[PDB]
Amino acid sequence: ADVKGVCTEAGMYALRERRIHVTQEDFELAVGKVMNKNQET
Amino acid sequence: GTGYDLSNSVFSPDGRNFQVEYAVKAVENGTTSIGIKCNDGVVFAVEKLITSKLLVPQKNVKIQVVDRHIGCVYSGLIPDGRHLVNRGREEAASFKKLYKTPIPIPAFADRLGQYVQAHTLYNSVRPFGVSTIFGGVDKNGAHLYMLEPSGSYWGYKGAATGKGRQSAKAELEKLVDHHPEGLSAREAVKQAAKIIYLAHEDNKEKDFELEISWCSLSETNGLHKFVKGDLLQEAIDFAQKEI
Amino acid sequence: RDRRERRLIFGTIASKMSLAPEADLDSLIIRNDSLSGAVIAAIMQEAGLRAVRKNRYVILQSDLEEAYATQVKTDNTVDKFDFYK
Amino acid sequence: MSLPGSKLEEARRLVNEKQYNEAEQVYLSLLDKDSSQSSAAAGASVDDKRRNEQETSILELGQLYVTMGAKDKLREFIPHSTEYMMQFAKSKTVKVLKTLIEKFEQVPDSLDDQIFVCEKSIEFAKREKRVFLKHSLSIKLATLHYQKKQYKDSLALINDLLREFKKLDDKPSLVDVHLLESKVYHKLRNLAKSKASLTAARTAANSIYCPTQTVAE
Amino acid sequence: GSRRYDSRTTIFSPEGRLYQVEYALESISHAGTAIGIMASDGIVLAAERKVTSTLLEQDTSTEKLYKLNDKIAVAVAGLTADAEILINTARIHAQNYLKTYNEDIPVEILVRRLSDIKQGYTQHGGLRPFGVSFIYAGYDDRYGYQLYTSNPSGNYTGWKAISVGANTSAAQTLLQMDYKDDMKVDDAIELALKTLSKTTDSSALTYDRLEFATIRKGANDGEVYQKIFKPQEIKDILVKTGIT
Amino acid sequence: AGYDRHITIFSPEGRLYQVEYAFKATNQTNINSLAVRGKDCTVVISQKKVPDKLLDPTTVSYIFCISRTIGMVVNGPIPDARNAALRAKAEAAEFRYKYGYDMPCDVLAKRMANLSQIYTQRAYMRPLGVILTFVSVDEELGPSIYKTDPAGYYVGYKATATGPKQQEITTNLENHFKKSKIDHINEESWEKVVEFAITHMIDALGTEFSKNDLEVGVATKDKFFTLSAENIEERLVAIAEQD
Amino acid sequence: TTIVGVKFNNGVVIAADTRSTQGPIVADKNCAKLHRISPKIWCAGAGTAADTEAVTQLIGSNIELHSLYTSREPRVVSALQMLKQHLFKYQGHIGAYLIVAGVDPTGSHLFSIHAHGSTDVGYYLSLGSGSLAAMAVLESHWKQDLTKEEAIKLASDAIQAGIWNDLGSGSNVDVCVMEIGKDAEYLRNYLTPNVREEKQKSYKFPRGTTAVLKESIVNICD
Amino acid sequence: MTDRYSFSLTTFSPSGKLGQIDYALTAVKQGVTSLGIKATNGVVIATEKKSSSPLAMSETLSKVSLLTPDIGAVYSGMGPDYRVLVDKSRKVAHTSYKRIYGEYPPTKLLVSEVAKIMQEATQSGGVRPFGVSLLIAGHDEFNGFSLYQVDPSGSYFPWKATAIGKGSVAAKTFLEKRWNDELELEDAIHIALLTLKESVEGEFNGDTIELAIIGDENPDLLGYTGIPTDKGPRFRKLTSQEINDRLEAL
């Protein structure tokens, strides 16, 4: 379930810059965001 | 939950005890008793309700005297009232053994106070459902105390509890305004008989009995004894005159 | 929240309010424990309401600490668990 | 008298009144004087609770060493305070190894003198088991190499701390590691490593809270 | 009254058993697994600790094993709190026999004196029985090597290979077919390593989560040597046996 | 299994139900009192409420004297108040004969707290429904106030209080210490300390009391006494003159 | 066994010898007769050394507990009161002689307890068999306003007098100095009036003088 | 007569456990979180002081007591029964050792005696189990520096470093990567401060944090001189000013 959430947040950081290319910059921010919700509470 | 009113040590959700409150209702189901405090001493009076004509007149003494300086009158269950004096009798005997001179009035109140407190701290025993009024003449002045089933007590200028507690004790407030400076021991005997008849309105359905006992330094000089002779009959005619 | 997300709310509401130049909002931020947005709104309002009866216009620093103890307590007298076992 | 407020505040006025040398002789006279509780410091006098006031004497004169030309002499001044702290408790050891450097890098000074002091302070942690003190001075040392604009000494300390802080402790301090690493590749005209370092810095920024000076950078 | 709050610890159920004793047997399955093995030349004991991590201290600790005598060991599987009560009284009763009769206590006498304590709470006292089980292994010149176990109910029987704790019936299945009367001390170690590996909840098996205390007999006959394997010696036998 | 709430046992929420109701028993009497630490001494004040005129004002008191060097004030019902009062006097006597010199304030609050912890852990004894507050002057740490909770947890306070309005009274004593940044009153004379705590109590409760409406205890160094009616009334005279 | 004490303005000091007396045969010439009840309070034993090395450990244990429960400094008045009622519980059947020395935040205190529970107080106190010979030397040289150095020489001359004038005392002298401002100072072998010289002939025997019946080696390590 | 309850309040639940000790561990997480770290040069334990009233005095409240001079102790929560356990622990430690063997017991033997009192509450009737969890840390001449975790159920386990309380979930995990084989006493203090600071939601200062460390034998804490054998107790309580010196050290 947590890995599936990475697919949703993979392009959310690209929506801010409005680019069709998704590099490793967005995947690194997606992993750190999912791990914070799991460790919270 | 359910059952907070079952045992003793269980507290109520508001921080009170049901068994203590149930013991108060047992005090109002017995014979009423009053008291009067003066400068020279205190005066005890109790109204004993006569059931049938089979009772023998003036052969029953409800007031149990501790040594010569302390009388004790109680309103409530008779068996529970005699156990308090029997416990206080041993405390007065144990005091006079080591401490020589007899125990004063404010000191004797602590022995009955803590002893009732221990019954509320255990689930194997029950608190006393009787209210005992005790007093007398101590070494300095005089004092009067009324022991409640909860163990709460203070100095009382007068103490009354029973079926006529709402009546007899309500008349004690008029006694303060009547003699704000002071009241003699002889006049307090006649005033005690009137208070019994003022609260007799609820006792008119049965037969009553008048028992008055006082102790002071003016006449008895530290001797607690019941009223006999023509002094008792004189207080009856003076009290029944206003009735 | 923490001392970060909260201080943005105090500084934003204080823009429309009128306070004293010596009033320090950071003093109450450290003491904030288990609060929310509606509680912060009631603090700034009550601080201005009590100023009328105190013959004041701008909100001083003393009125912020007096009006803070009203909305911080979360149940009745007990806060949440208070302190005991 | 023995009142520290009379000696310290009087020397502060003598700087602008006459010269800073008159105030320097007063602060240097506190080495054998101004006794305190607990144990001693240099062995001549006892300095424990007033050691912070003794460090202030260096901090006040630290800004006045620029005109006098003591920049080259500041190399051995800081490490001498480490030996004076071995007599009394070590609770004041971390403050002296930091507060001084905080005011040492604020005043203008040569880049060669700033690096050799930090490398000397690490030597005290080399003989010991010190970890946090070794990592706190290492991240501040690599920052000084950035002003020199050299990738040899800058990437040497970053690559050592990157392979450690990842799986080791000092997770909030790792944000400044990626922040300094992104600056090194910025002068080399490399947008691949610089933008990738900012991602690792902003990743842990949302997890563990960072102060105002860290978020602003 | 005290009759309402009393849960009636020891009472005969309509089925003919005890409530607190029946529930105490389940507590063994929630604790570590202790498996004893009685070989020809000695006795090999095995145990596994529960709730272990990296922060645990592996230097000197024994949770599931103790030493009640020079020639007698013990394996503890169950609640640790209720175990120290019977262990402290074990060494007291063991030395009393040595203080009077001036000879080493056998296992049969040591267990029956400790079992009567557990049998006492199940009868009188109105208290709960011990929810911890023990495995007693020692050497004696009467019956030879003796391996016994206990139960919260206070009963003890002879066992060649005993398994208590989590997965009791799962471990005894592999121990029944692989048991032999000629099995030596070295072959008895391989039997416990293969059993504890398949019956655990993890993937691999390390030396930090296991405890082994055997009984070895030296060149001099009549006296054995109690040796508790240190973590340095536990990781060595894992490589030689191929468990790793 | 509804009996889990009637005694002291571990709850499924990880708390104690009977201990929560022990604090609620102190609000039955609704008596507000506070204690502050002076410079060289400690002065405690209490609200004296007499429901009936038949009560003797000298006999009714919420402040009890454990020893000559230690005073005590207790909130809540009197029977549980005087139960621990005689227990505290016994511990002060055993410490003089067996252990050494007179008992200080912290030791008395610690021994009475540990005594209640045994009663709280054991299920056959109910905890006390009152709160023990001891005031005295130590020969080492000087003035100190230790308030013993019915749960058996003692902790030192600068200026304490009691009652249901304690939270409103604490704000008065707290705001005074934040502005001056002092942990105790700098007034050396004990007379000004008496009128100090009375001033903050009147403004907090919004009620002007009388000579019989308050009882002010004064604990000096190696001496303790209770102010009479003339001493308490004398303090109220200078308060109206200054403010 | 001879013990004395000197109470001066800034504190109290006591002294004791190293020679324990079992009777006419002296087994041990070097021992510490100053017991420690608490770190800041010292006590001196006299008479029977068996009862002093026990009661002081039993009573001293409860006093160390009382200091930890109260989180304060143990006082001499608290130490004597615990020891006073202890010997009275046994009805004085336990022979003991002890001098409790030390100070506290309230002053300086010096006391001496007898075997049956009687307690004494004074600036100078001496107990034991050599208490008589050491008492006369103290009373002669004792005066008001004694300093720290004068109190050491006064307490040293008392024990030294019991060395020459009593058979129940000798060997070395142990002096424990206690000060209010500073901590306790325990000086062992402060004075060595008796020093044995070298023997005339060497009695060391060569190997093989005494015949050996049977030699064996007993195993120790298991 | 006295008490009529002779039965134990702890009974076996149908799930196979004891209902009293299960809820006892839950009550430990209902209060302030303590911690501790063992190193080669000593053991460093820390805790937090939560004041119920703003006018309370933190100096009179000591959450770290002293059983033996070489061994400290720290609890979690308010510790209602903590004062009962320590008073009973100091008696059994001196009676069974100081009054018999003449010396203080080591760390491994003392935690066995502390748990010996708590294990009787779960069996002997008329009483309830202790809802507190202590930490036994000290130094001896054989085991050296060791820290034992005392569970409310009556069982003890050795641990290098652990944190039990309301924040026991996050604080215990953070100490796994922050601990290694070679550590000093002062280096382990910074480990305790970084973990405890994240668990403090209130005021952060030296008065609300009690930091107890076990170092070498200190002659200043002894009280007498002249005996080379006893150099003083190893356990030491840091003052309010010394704790604040290491708070800004981070």
CSV table of N, CA and C in Angstrom, one decimal, chain F residues 100-148:
chain,number,residue,atom,x,y,z
F,100,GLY,N,15.9,11.1,66.9
F,100,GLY,CA,16.7,12.3,67.1
F,100,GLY,C,15.8,13.5,67.4
F,101,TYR,N,16.3,14.7,67.1
F,101,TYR,CA,15.7,16.0,67.4
F,101,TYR,C,14.4,16.1,66.7
F,102,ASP,N,13.7,17.3,66.8
F,102,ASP,CA,12.4,17.5,66.3
F,102,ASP,C,12.3,17.3,64.8
F,103,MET,N,11.2,16.8,64.4
F,103,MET,CA,11.0,16.5,62.9
F,103,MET,C,10.8,17.8,62.1
F,104,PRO,N,11.5,17.9,61.0
F,104,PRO,CA,11.3,19.0,60.1
F,104,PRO,C,10.0,18.9,59.2
F,105,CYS,N,9.8,19.8,58.3
F,105,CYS,CA,8.5,19.8,57.5
F,105,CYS,C,8.5,18.7,56.4
F,106,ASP,N,9.6,18.5,55.7
F,106,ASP,CA,9.7,17.6,54.6
F,106,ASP,C,9.6,16.2,55.0
F,107,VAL,N,10.1,15.8,56.2
F,107,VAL,CA,10.0,14.4,56.6
F,107,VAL,C,8.6,14.1,57.0
F,108,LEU,N,7.9,15.0,57.6
F,108,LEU,CA,6.5,14.7,58.0
F,108,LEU,C,5.6,14.6,56.8
F,109,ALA,N,5.8,15.3,55.7
F,109,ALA,CA,5.0,15.2,54.5
F,109,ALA,C,5.4,13.9,53.7
F,110,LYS,N,6.7,13.5,53.9
F,110,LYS,CA,7.1,12.3,53.2
F,110,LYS,C,6.6,11.0,53.8
F,111,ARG,N,6.6,11.0,55.2
F,111,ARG,CA,6.2,9.8,55.9
F,111,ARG,C,4.7,9.6,55.8
F,112,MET,N,3.9,10.7,55.8
F,112,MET,CA,2.5,10.6,55.7
F,112,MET,C,2.1,10.3,54.2
F,113,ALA,N,2.9,10.6,53.3
F,113,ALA,CA,2.6,10.3,51.9
F,113,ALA,C,2.9,8.8,51.7
F,114,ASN,N,4.0,8.3,52.2
F,114,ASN,CA,4.3,6.9,52.1
F,114,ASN,C,3.3,6.0,52.8
F,115,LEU,N,2.7,6.5,53.9
F,115,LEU,CA,1.7,5.8,54.6
F,115,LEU,C,0.4,5.7,53.8
F,116,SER,N,0.1,6.7,53.0
F,116,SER,CA,-1.1,6.6,52.2
F,116,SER,C,-0.8,5.8,50.9
F,117,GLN,N,0.4,5.7,50.5
F,117,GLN,CA,0.8,4.8,49.3
F,117,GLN,C,0.5,3.4,49.6
F,118,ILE,N,0.8,3.0,50.9
F,118,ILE,CA,0.5,1.6,51.3
F,118,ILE,C,-1.0,1.3,51.3
F,119,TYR,N,-1.8,2.3,51.8
F,119,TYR,CA,-3.2,2.2,51.8
F,119,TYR,C,-3.8,2.2,50.4
F,120,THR,N,-3.1,2.9,49.5
F,120,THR,CA,-3.6,2.9,48.1
F,120,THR,C,-3.3,1.6,47.4
F,121,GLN,N,-2.1,1.1,47.5
F,121,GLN,CA,-1.8,-0.2,46.9
F,121,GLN,C,-2.6,-1.3,47.4
F,122,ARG,N,-2.8,-1.4,48.7
F,122,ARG,CA,-3.6,-2.5,49.3
F,122,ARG,C,-5.1,-2.3,49.0
F,123,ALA,N,-5.7,-3.3,48.5
F,123,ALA,CA,-7.1,-3.2,48.1
F,123,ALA,C,-8.1,-3.2,49.2
F,124,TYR,N,-7.7,-3.6,50.4
F,124,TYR,CA,-8.7,-3.6,51.6
F,124,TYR,C,-8.7,-2.3,52.3
F,125,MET,N,-8.0,-1.3,51.9
F,125,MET,CA,-8.0,0.0,52.6
F,125,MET,C,-8.4,1.1,51.6
F,126,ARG,N,-9.3,1.9,51.9
F,126,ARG,CA,-9.6,3.0,51.0
F,126,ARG,C,-8.7,4.2,51.2
F,127,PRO,N,-8.4,4.9,50.2
F,127,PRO,CA,-7.5,6.1,50.3
F,127,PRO,C,-8.2,7.2,51.0
F,128,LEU,N,-7.5,8.1,51.6
F,128,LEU,CA,-8.0,9.3,52.3
F,128,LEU,C,-8.6,10.2,51.3
F,129,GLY,N,-9.8,10.8,51.7
F,129,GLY,CA,-10.5,11.7,50.8
F,129,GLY,C,-10.2,13.2,51.1
F,130,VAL,N,-9.0,13.4,51.7
F,130,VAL,CA,-8.6,14.7,52.0
F,130,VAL,C,-7.2,15.0,51.5
F,131,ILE,N,-6.6,16.2,51.7
F,131,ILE,CA,-5.3,16.6,51.2
F,131,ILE,C,-4.5,17.1,52.4
F,132,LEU,N,-3.3,16.6,52.6
F,132,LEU,CA,-2.5,17.0,53.7
F,132,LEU,C,-1.6,18.1,53.2
F,133,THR,N,-1.6,19.3,53.9
F,133,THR,CA,-0.7,20.4,53.6
F,133,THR,C,0.0,20.8,54.8
F,134,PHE,N,1.3,20.7,54.8
F,134,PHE,CA,2.1,21.0,56.0
F,134,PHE,C,2.9,22.3,55.8
F,135,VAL,N,3.0,23.1,56.8
F,135,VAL,CA,3.8,24.3,56.7
F,135,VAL,C,4.6,24.4,58.0
F,136,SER,N,5.9,24.8,57.8
F,136,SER,CA,6.8,24.9,58.9
F,136,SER,C,8.0,25.7,58.4
F,137,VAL,N,9.0,25.9,59.3
F,137,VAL,CA,10.3,26.6,59.0
F,137,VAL,C,11.4,25.7,59.4
F,138,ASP,N,12.2,25.2,58.4
F,138,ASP,CA,13.3,24.4,58.6
F,138,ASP,C,14.5,25.2,59.0
F,139,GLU,N,15.4,24.6,59.8
F,139,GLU,CA,16.7,25.2,60.2
F,139,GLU,C,17.7,25.2,59.1
F,140,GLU,N,17.5,24.5,58.0
F,140,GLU,CA,18.5,24.4,56.9
F,140,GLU,C,18.0,25.1,55.6
F,141,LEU,N,16.9,24.6,55.0
F,141,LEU,CA,16.3,25.2,53.8
F,141,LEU,C,15.4,26.4,54.1
F,142,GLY,N,15.2,26.7,55.4
F,142,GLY,CA,14.3,27.8,55.7
F,142,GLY,C,12.8,27.5,55.5
F,143,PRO,N,12.0,28.5,55.1
F,143,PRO,CA,10.6,28.2,54.9
F,143,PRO,C,10.3,27.3,53.8
F,144,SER,N,9.4,26.4,54.0
F,144,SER,CA,9.1,25.4,52.9
F,144,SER,C,7.6,25.0,53.1
F,145,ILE,N,7.0,24.7,52.0
F,145,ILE,CA,5.6,24.2,52.1
F,145,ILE,C,5.5,22.9,51.2
F,146,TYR,N,5.0,21.8,51.8
F,146,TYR,CA,4.8,20.6,51.1
F,146,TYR,C,3.4,20.1,51.2
F,147,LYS,N,2.8,19.9,50.1
F,147,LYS,CA,1.4,19.5,50.0
F,147,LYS,C,1.3,18.1,49.6
F,148,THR,N,0.8,17.3,50.5
F,148,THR,CA,0.7,15.8,50.3
F,148,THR,C,-0.7,15.5,49.6
